[PDB]
Amino acid sequence: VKRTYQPNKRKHSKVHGFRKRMSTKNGRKVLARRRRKGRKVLSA
Amino acid sequence: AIKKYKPITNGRRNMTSLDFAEITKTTPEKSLLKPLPKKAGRNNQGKLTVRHHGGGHKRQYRVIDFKRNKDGINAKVDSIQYDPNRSANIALVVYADGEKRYIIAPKGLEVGQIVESGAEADIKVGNALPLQNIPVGTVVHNIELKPGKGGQIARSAGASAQVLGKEGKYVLIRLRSGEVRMILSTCRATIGQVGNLQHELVNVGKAGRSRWKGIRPTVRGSVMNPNDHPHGGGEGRAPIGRPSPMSPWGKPTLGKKTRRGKKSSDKLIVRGRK
RNA sequence: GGCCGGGCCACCA
RNA sequence: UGAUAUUGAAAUUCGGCUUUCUAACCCGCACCACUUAUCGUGGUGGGAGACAGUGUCAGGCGGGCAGUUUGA
RNA sequence: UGAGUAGCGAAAGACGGGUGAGAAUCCCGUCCACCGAUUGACUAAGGUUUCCAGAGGAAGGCUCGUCCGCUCUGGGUUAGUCGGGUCCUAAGCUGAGGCCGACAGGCGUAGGCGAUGGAUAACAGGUUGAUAUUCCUGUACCACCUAUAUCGAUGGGGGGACGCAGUAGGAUAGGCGAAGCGUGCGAUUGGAUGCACGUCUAAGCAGUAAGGCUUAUUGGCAAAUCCGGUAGCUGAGCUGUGAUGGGGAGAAUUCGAGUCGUUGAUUUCACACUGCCGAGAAAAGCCUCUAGAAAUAGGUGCCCGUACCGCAAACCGACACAGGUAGUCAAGAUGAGAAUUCUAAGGUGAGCGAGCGAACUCUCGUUAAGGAACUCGGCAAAAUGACCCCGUAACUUCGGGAGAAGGGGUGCUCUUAGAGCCGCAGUGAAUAGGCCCAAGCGACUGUUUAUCAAAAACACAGGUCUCUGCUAAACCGUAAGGUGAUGUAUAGGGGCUGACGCCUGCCCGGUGCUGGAAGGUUAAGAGGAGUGGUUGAAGCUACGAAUCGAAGCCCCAGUAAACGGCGGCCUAAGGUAGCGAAAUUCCUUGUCGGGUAAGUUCCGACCCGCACGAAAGGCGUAACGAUUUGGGCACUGUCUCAACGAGA
RNA sequence: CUACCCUUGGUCAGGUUGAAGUUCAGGUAACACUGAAUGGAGGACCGAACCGACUUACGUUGAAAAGUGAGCGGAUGAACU
RNA sequence: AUCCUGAGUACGACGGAGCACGUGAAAUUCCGUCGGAAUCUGGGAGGACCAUCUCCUAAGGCUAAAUACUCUCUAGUG
Ligand SMILES: [K+]
Ligand SMILES: [K+]
Ligand SMILES: [K+]
Ligand SMILES: [K+]
Ligand SMILES: [K+]
Ligand SMILES: [K+]
Ligand SMILES: [Mg+2]
Ligand SMILES: [Mg+2]
Ligand SMILES: [Mg+2]
Ligand SMILES: [Mg+2]
Ligand SMILES: [Mg+2]
Ligand SMILES: [Mg+2]
Ligand SMILES: [Mg+2]
Ligand SMILES: [Mg+2]
Ligand SMILES: [Mg+2]
Ligand SMILES: [Mg+2]
Ligand SMILES: [Mg+2]
Ligand SMILES: [Mg+2]
Ligand SMILES: [Mg+2]
Ligand SMILES: [Mg+2]
Ligand SMILES: [Mg+2]
Ligand SMILES: [Mg+2]
Ligand SMILES: [Mg+2]
Ligand SMILES: [Mg+2]
Ligand SMILES: [Mg+2]
Ligand SMILES: [Mg+2]
Ligand SMILES: [Mg+2]
Ligand SMILES: [Mg+2]
Ligand SMILES: [Mg+2]
Ligand SMILES: [Mg+2]
Ligand SMILES: [Mg+2]
Ligand SMILES: [Mg+2]
Ligand SMILES: [Mg+2]
Ligand SMILES: [Mg+2]
Ligand SMILES: [Mg+2]
Ligand SMILES: [Mg+2]
Ligand SMILES: [Mg+2]
Ligand SMILES: [Mg+2]
Ligand SMILES: [Mg+2]
Ligand SMILES: [Mg+2]
Ligand SMILES: [Mg+2]
Ligand SMILES: [Mg+2]
Ligand SMILES: [Mg+2]
Ligand SMILES: [Mg+2]
Ligand SMILES: [Mg+2]
Ligand SMILES: [Mg+2]
Ligand SMILES: [Mg+2]
Ligand SMILES: [Mg+2]
Ligand SMILES: [Mg+2]
Ligand SMILES: [Mg+2]
Ligand SMILES: [Mg+2]
Ligand SMILES: [Mg+2]
Ligand SMILES: [Mg+2]
Ligand SMILES: [Mg+2]
Ligand SMILES: [Mg+2]
Ligand SMILES: [Mg+2]
Ligand SMILES: [Mg+2]
Ligand SMILES: [Mg+2]
Ligand SMILES: [Mg+2]
Ligand SMILES: [Mg+2]
Ligand SMILES: [Mg+2]
Ligand SMILES: [Mg+2]
Ligand SMILES: [Mg+2]
Ligand SMILES: [Mg+2]
Ligand SMILES: [Mg+2]
Ligand SMILES: [Mg+2]
Ligand SMILES: [Mg+2]
Ligand SMILES: [Mg+2]
Ligand SMILES: [Mg+2]
Ligand SMILES: [Mg+2]
Ligand SMILES: [Mg+2]
Ligand SMILES: [Mg+2]
Ligand SMILES: [Mg+2]
Ligand SMILES: [Mg+2]
Ligand SMILES: [Mg+2]
Ligand SMILES: [Mg+2]
Ligand SMILES: [Mg+2]
Ligand SMILES: [Mg+2]
Ligand SMILES: [Mg+2]
């Protein structure tokens, strides 16, 4: 049966990518939180 | 006239349609078309704000000359055409200088007939004049509310209004709804009645034919749940169960008037209707 | 309780 | 829905009422320019006009929505 | 611990030979078997090295393992023309200025980004362990540059440029046949001398082509010789060349033939033509107008992707998981068919086996006599079934019902519809409607509780009420800005009803809605008579009645396809038509009749309607239904009543 | 994923039925009207692909956190993708 | 004390907020709306308010230190 995750490079980059995060204040808050926690990966 | 289909199927039973015998040309005029993507009742927020809109056939917009501001030049009617965007047919008119325009097709307008607009135009069907120069008792359509803005009243199939009198800078008109109101004397109107009178006679016949027109199904409030509608809930079928029938947004919806107060047009509306 | 001829208004031991 | 501010000039009639005016304010009206632009701003006409809209105050309606109560 | 227990994930393997310390499990061979509108071939997404070679066998692999999509080491993806960028726009996103907003921000103009669409120059053959329209060979094309002898729009106009169905044709691909020509083979099982295949070759460049379509003067911001007004272009395919090249059934690097018939597209001409209503993108490339201001030869041509899996062992499902995953190619026999069965191309034998042939479970086949007696219920199974020809009821909205029902035929051989031949049986396998009578509900096709409900529920076409005069009403939003609508009362929103037919009664007292009267009542505000405190007073200060003062509410009227109500003298009025033990009836298995040997269910009546009733519609109604309910024929292991056989 | 929607693409073996129109032959003062032919309409019929999910059997420490087998509904449309 | 000394200001009504303080005998501070002074014989406060007395001189601005914290750095401690 069809499952929830149907991968799509373009969709993934456009919704969760770096530039989409930079595009809003709350996305920049996400990036700041992840930098503060010390994550290796900040976004897609 | 109206075509009555034979009941070859349960869907075709009692279905009728226009025969399109007044349509003299079956394709539009290319230079006057414009794209018209569907909104499906969704506004600039992307949110549905009007229910029951969506789907339906693809349509191209026909640019219609509602203003009729090309004064002093004759125009010959070249063809009567189907317009998917409105109930009336439209007429392609060719001006004496070669300019081609679309106008609402009046009842009785014929190919080869000459229409003209302006203060000096004759009182004949398809001619557009200011209300100042239109005699009392004349049946008109495509009436402007503001000078130069273009006709806004009496534009659908079979629509008409009659001139009643002249009181100063306003002209008294009885509209198709039955309302009697004043309109500025410099506002233009076109002589005659809008054509395609049989438009309201069509028996749609089946649900799918409504779907082709972009109408999505209406769900009654009585079969919703209380969190969806004031009429929702109850065990089994239920009556209204409150003093007044209600809209889905919680407002009385049988007889309650909604015209707002203190409008600038109150002074201009002499007798109302609907 | 207020006011007017029962009706409107008012009432935070 | 009322008062008041924005809000100005004349009259008629009984602190008001009414009518007229234009110049505030308004126009999802027309044309013009910026400008290859159905936004905007400015200009000129037209319409409307001390109304409307908006602020503050006040009365009314208000399961549309909300916080809760509904004893032993 | 349970326990050496459950399981080891859809299936056909056998043997020989090899390798090895070790082999059902690896390699090779032969035979057998499975898929084949696909278990074959090729694209896309997604994955991201899983690809190739050599070496390995700790762990992973549901067993084994010498093997591997696992481990180690070394390798592998080649483009002016393929797909994308240096081209175009759609939805949508964004947005200089701008509009709006406690902040944060929201919206939006020009503009921009953005394919799933438009434009756009390369084909055939060969070659590797792993790449190929990319490398090589052959033959091309496109853009730009140079060398040797009118151009014109970030302007106008045209064009690009478009739905759905159906029909008749042209051509071609492909299929089949004869063997015309060629290439192999001619067989120790009784016979014959016949059996088995091949029959190709691109872009490009020339030529050809069935077909298909069809002069003057004066608004497109200035001008136009263009467009608008007025008084020939396209086109599948063919032929030659490309190519004495290449490939070839085969034979010994050399040689080796490319034809006749038939059928004929789902491909193409081509959305060409015809018809229809629901009326079917944009922009650039391109052509042209105006303002305005050659061939030939040689050379140059960038970036990104390119391995491999890809209807899966590599993607989504935690798995080497019976699931999910867009498009394309579409052989033969049979047939209407892409159904069915067997095959071709090509792929595959399923990552535990060996025995045995107990109970019991599951899947499958048969069954004496009977034939629904089973059971809540014929649940399941059985029966029906294709094609051709007869024949076909009530009812009906005249379409239908209808494939009603019910019958008949079918093999093979020969002769020109007959004559024969064989079997138990001839659509001899596989696949292919069970039907009829009656009632309830809903008109109908459709929709629904992803994952216990598919329905009588929702929707629906139709009806009616109501709102709405356009900056409409309604709706989203604080606003700006939007939807409604580039619509305008034959339109748009909301309520209820639910095809159609015949109809839809009584009550406006109450509530809601609509309109009237400005009589009573009321707030802010105005208006200030008067009074207290303090300083005989002003004065400062705390309060304070006349009266003016809106809507609402009270009052009056109307309105029931508004909310509602439809008696037991009382009311506002006391239920019309139709229907009725009903999807409604407690008593109740009401009573009577029909149907059965027997009928709490069913059908027809009665009316005593606990507690039907007219758009939360009444009563009917052809057609329709994986709906509910009763009856009947067929048929059967459902049952009497169980028996045997096959496999897991 | 799922619901609705927007833009732009794609897909639907075969068989059956036979609406409107048109032509002819009648018929008529004219028009109705009749018969044949043709024509090819439909949320039309049967039925693969495809989309569903009515019954039943199996599965229920599953092959599968919703499936499989056998039938079953739709299958040019309010279709599916 | 001849002139100057912060005006839509102080202040008031209504609605709110901040003050320990819930509008209360509520002074004192601020905001919106509307109104709106006095001018050294002036003005403000001393918890309603008035008079006297006392203290001060709003409606312009600037100002170290004592105080708060530790991602850090240096040296140490339990
Ligand atoms: K119409
Ligand atoms: K490659
Ligand atoms: K009543
Ligand atoms: K009433
Ligand atoms: K009864
Ligand atoms: K009842
Ligand atoms: Mg609607
Ligand atoms: Mg509905
Ligand atoms: Mg419900
Ligand atoms: Mg509610
Ligand atoms: Mg209710
Ligand atoms: Mg009920
Ligand atoms: Mg008001
Ligand atoms: Mg509540
Ligand atoms: Mg709480
Ligand atoms: Mg208790
Ligand atoms: Mg154990
Ligand atoms: Mg054991
Ligand atoms: Mg045990
Ligand atoms: Mg055991
Ligand atoms: Mg076992
Ligand atoms: Mg296995
Ligand atoms: Mg087979
Ligand atoms: Mg490998
Ligand atoms: Mg192992
Ligand atoms: Mg490896
Ligand atoms: Mg924006
Ligand atoms: Mg702002
Ligand atoms: Mg593309
Ligand atoms: Mg390869
Ligand atoms: Mg077009
Ligand atoms: Mg054709
Ligand atoms: Mg085919
Ligand atoms: Mg078509
Ligand atoms: Mg490859
Ligand atoms: Mg693999
Ligand atoms: Mg396996
Ligand atoms: Mg799998
Ligand atoms: Mg799968
Ligand atoms: Mg076929
Ligand atoms: Mg098959
Ligand atoms: Mg038997
Ligand atoms: Mg027997
Ligand atoms: Mg029998
Ligand atoms: Mg029985
Ligand atoms: Mg029994
Ligand atoms: Mg059954
Ligand atoms: Mg058959
Ligand atoms: Mg026979
Ligand atoms: Mg139904
Ligand atoms: Mg159905
Ligand atoms: Mg369910
Ligand atoms: Mg349950
Ligand atoms: Mg179900
Ligand atoms: Mg709009
Ligand atoms: Mg209903
Ligand atoms: Mg009903
Ligand atoms: Mg009634
Ligand atoms: Mg009344
Ligand atoms: Mg009042
Ligand atoms: Mg008052
Ligand atoms: Mg009872
Ligand atoms: Mg019986
Ligand atoms: Mg009965
Ligand atoms: Mg009822
Ligand atoms: Mg009713
Ligand atoms: Mg049976
Ligand atoms: Mg296909
Ligand atoms: Mg159908
Ligand atoms: Mg699929
Ligand atoms: Mg479903
Ligand atoms: Mg199935
Ligand atoms: Mg059916
Ligand atoms: Mg079907
Ligand atoms: Mg000072
Ligand atoms: Mg406070
Ligand atoms: Mg204070
Ligand atoms: Mg205080
Ligand atoms: Mg003070």
Residue numbers in the entry:
A (entry chain 2): 2 to 45
B (entry chain C): 2 to 275
Can you list sentences taken from the study reporting this PDB entry?
In Staphylococcus aureus, an opportunistic pathogen, macrolide resistance is primarily mediated by Erm-family methyltransferases, which mono- or dimethylate A2058 in the 23S ribosomal RNA, reducing drug binding. Using cryo-electron microscopy, we determined the high-resolution structures of solithromycin-bound ribosomes, including those with dimethylated A2058. Our focus is on solithromycin (SOL), a bactericidal fourth-generation macrolide, because of its enhanced ribosomal binding properties. Our study demonstrates that SOL can bind to the ribosome both in unmodified and in double-methylated states.
Hence, we determined the cryo-EM structure of the ribosome–SOL complex from MNY196, which features both hyperproduced and hyperactive ErmB. The data were collected and processed under conditions similar to those of SA_KES34_SOL, yielding a 2.15 Å cryo-EM reconstruction of the 70S ribosome. Multibody refinement focused on the large subunit revealed at 2.08 Å resolution that the antibiotic can be accommodated into the ribosome at high concentrations and bind its pocket, despite the double methylation of A2058. Importantly, the density corresponding to the two methyl groups of A2058 is clearly resolved, confirming their presence and suggesting that they contribute to the subtle displacement of the coordinating water molecule. The density of the antibiotic is also clearly defined, indicating stable binding within the ribosome. Comparative analysis of the NPET using the PoseEdit 2D interaction maps shows that SOL establishes a nearly identical contact network in the unmethylated (SA_KES34_SOL) and dimethylated (SA_MNY196_SOL) ribosomes: the main difference is the loss of a water-mediated hydrogen bond to A2058 when the nucleotide is dimethylated, owing to a 1.1 Å shift of the water molecule. Despite this change, critical stabilizing interactions are retained, such as those in the proximity of the fluorine atom to C2611 and the aromatic–aromatic (π–π) interaction with the A752:U2609 base pair. These interactions appear sufficient to stabilize SOL within the binding site, even in the presence of a dimethylated A2058. The direct hydrogen bond between the desosamine group of SOL and the N1 of A2058 elongates from 2.75 Å in the unmethylated state to > 3 Å in the dimethylated state, indicating a weaker interaction. In SA_MNY196_SOL, the strong SOL density in the cryo-EM map suggests that SOL binds directly to the dimethylated ribosome rather than selectively interacting with a subpopulation of unmethylated or partially methylated ribosomes as suggested by Chen et al (2023) relating to TEL binding.
